[PDB]
Amino acid sequence: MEVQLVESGGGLVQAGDSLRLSCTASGRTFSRAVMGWFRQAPGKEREFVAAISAAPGTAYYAFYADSVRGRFSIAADSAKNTVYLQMNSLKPEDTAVYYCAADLKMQVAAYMNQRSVDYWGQGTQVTVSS
Amino acid sequence: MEVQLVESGGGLVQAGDSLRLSCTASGRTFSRAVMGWFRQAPGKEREFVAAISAAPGTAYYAFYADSVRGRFSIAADSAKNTVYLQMNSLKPEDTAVYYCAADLKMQVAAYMNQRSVDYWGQGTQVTVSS
Secondary structure (H helix, E strand, C coil), X not given: CECCEEEECCEEEECCCCEEEEEEECHHHHHHCEEEEEEECCCECCEXXXXXXXXXXXXXXXXXXXXXXXXXXXXXXXXHCEEEEEECCCCHHHCEEEEEEEECCCCCCCCCCHHHCCEECCCEEEEEEC | CECCEEEECCEEXXXXXXXXXXXXXXXXXXXXXXXXXXXXXXXXXXXXXXXXXXXXXXXXXXXXXXXXCCCEXXXXXXXXXXXXXXXXXXXXXXXXXXXXXXECCCCCCCCCCHHHCCEECCCEEEEEEC
């Protein structure tokens, strides 16, 4: 089986800056699974960040962890089978490895369980400098 | 919550040589999960390599996927909450990002699907050259 998720984006930014990360999914996972993002901060377990409903074309729901509400948004490009994590007003405490995830047992954006993830892209380092 | 799995090892190695990976887990996870290893070849989804489960007393049960059978040894140390993967007779084909895994529902070591995994170590590159 070919890899289901490929992440792009990452790097060091300054507090107050923004950055958008992308992740491409197979056509099959894009349409069948809820897609989302997780982040793993130094010495901490990975935590849910954002989710988008399955097959996000012209319409979708979006759901966010309270710690990134308003600052972060999630989006999609169906034509390129890609989902995006947009991160505004970054703080040093957002410094983490970020992971894209798909859960095929979900249809509506909601809190994703780390354990219910079917596929993961490879994590990318995001560092926000004080 | 603190990070459940912290893994070590990896790097560049020559065909026919040996390389060891290790991974520590928290006390509660180590005693509650079957431990295993997965690998993700470039452009591929992550596939099962090996699992190990605790049995009464000093005993363990070990299970190996067909592709790494006889070349790889899986081992565990209760006092150090650590699992090991000794890889020997490495081929260029064995080049991948290797991942440690914990599965809380499984009781005895057996084939492990990536979806059934509750927790992951952070991946580590293992390159085998001709």
